[PDB]
Amino acid sequence: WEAGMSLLMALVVLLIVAGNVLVIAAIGSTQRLQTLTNLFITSLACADLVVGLLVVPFGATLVVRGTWLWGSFLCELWTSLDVLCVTASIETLCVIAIDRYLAITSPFRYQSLMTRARAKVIICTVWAISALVSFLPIMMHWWRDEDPQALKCYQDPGCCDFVTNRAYAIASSIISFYIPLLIMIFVALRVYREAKEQIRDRASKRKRVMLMREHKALKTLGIIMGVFTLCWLPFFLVNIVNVFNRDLVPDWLFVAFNWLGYANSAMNPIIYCRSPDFRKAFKRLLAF
Numbered sequence: 001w002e003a004g005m006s007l008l009m010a011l012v013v014l015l016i017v018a019g020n021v022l023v024i025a026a027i028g029s030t031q032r033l034q035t036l037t038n039l040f041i042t043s044l045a046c047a048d049l050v051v052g053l054l055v056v057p058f059g060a061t062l063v064v065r066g067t068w069l070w071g072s073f074l075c076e077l078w079t080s081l082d083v084l085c086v087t088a089s090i091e092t093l094c095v096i097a098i099d100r101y102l103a104i105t106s107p108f109r110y111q112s113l114m115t116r117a118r119a120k121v122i123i124c125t126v127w128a129i130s131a132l133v134s135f136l137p138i139m140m141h142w143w144r145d146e147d148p149q150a151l152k153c154y155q156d157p158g159c160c161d162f163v164t165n166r167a168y169a170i171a172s173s174i175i176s177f178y179i180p181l182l183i184m185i186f187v188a189l190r191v192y193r194e195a196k197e198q199i200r201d202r203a204s205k206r207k208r209v210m211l212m213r214e215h216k217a218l219k220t221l222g223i224i225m226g227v228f229t230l231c232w233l234p235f236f237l238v239n240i241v242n243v244f245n246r247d248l249v250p251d252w253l254f255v256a257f258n259w260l261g262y263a264n265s266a267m268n269p270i271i272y273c274r275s276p277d278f279r280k281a282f283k284r285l286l287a288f
């Protein structure tokens with residue numbers, strides 16, 4: 001592992017940036033990929049794209065140099081963007097979970113109402129809600145603390161630690177993560193028990209094949225979500241324990257799970273290779 005993880009980090013920017021750009025272009029070419037569900041996937045990709053383009057590069061100069069070299073302002077701005085992307089992602093994963101549920105339960109009402117021009121409004125909203133609950137409180141300094149040590153970090157332009165009061169710490173992590181998480185999980189468990197009773201004896205390859213595509217594609221969504229959890233959940237669990245006893249967890253561990261979450265921005269394009277369409281579409285653009 002000390003090899004794979006060591007290699008992983010030198011290409012993360014690449015694997016994220018190139019991996020996600022490869023996904024947005026794959027769908028922008030094949031209109032057979034141009035569906036409703038794949039529009040939310042593009043949102044997800046834009047999030048991850050920003051991560052590897054802004055979040056990770058600056059996170060790298062900080063970790064490597066062991067100091068912030070960009071100034072007090074960009075520090076806050078970088079922090080904002082970082083928080084915005086994670087919230088937007090977990091919310092979009094909710095929308096997707098709910099979308100697939102309403103397309104499984106109310107098919108008719110789904111087709112006459114859910115249009116391509118409307119899924120775009122739904123996406124602009126999720127970026128709007130995330131900008132509110134993530135970007136604004138940081139701008140109004142609702143995050144800050146009063147501890148001498150905390151105040152010490154704010155006077156230093158070279159310090160970019162997210163030292164926050166225990167009120168904010170708990171509120172922001174519940175709003176951004178745990179709520180959409182619990183919602184996405186709950187809804188995702190529902191969509192599964194629905195997809196199980198569908199394929200649960202007397203139908204030709206007319207109904208079997210159409211349910212063979214809409215089950216292999218659903219299984220991928222469940223992975224995108226399950227993976228997203230395994231990556232970020234640790235960071236947020238530790239972020240809560242820090243509130244109870246601030247000296248219980250080492251700082252290197254705090255930075256450990258945070259880069260684990262960043263890895264999720266490169267994993268998506270990879271999992272999308274469970275589909276022939278994407279797989280072929282990738283090899284298309286890669287001049288194979």
Ligand SMILES: CC(C)(C)NC[C@H](O)COc1cccc2c1CC(C#N)=N2
Pocket residue numbers: 078079082083086087161162164168169170172173176177239258261
């Ligand atoms: C180096 C930094 C600190 C930039 N990493 C931030 C992390 O990626 C994301 O942290 C958060 C994401 C969403 C919601 C959050 C959150 C931290 C808190 C708190 N209280 N609420």
Ligand SMILES: CCCCCCCCS[C@@H]1O[C@H](CO)[C@@H](O)[C@H](O)[C@H]1O
Pocket residue numbers: 073076077080138139140141
């Ligand atoms: C889209 C802009 C995102 C900024 C995110 C970090 C905000 C830090 S507080 C912010 O700092 C600015 C510069 O000092 C002031 O001019 C503002 O009044 C104040 O609210």
Ligand SMILES: CCCCCCCCS[C@@H]1O[C@H](CO)[C@@H](O)[C@H](O)[C@H]1O
Pocket residue numbers: 133137141142143165167168169171172
């Ligand atoms: C995303 C929303 C996070 C809300 C966090 C809980 C509400 C208080 S935050 C913070 O508490 C400080 C001490 O009470 C006050 O001095 C500040 O003015 C205030 O901003």
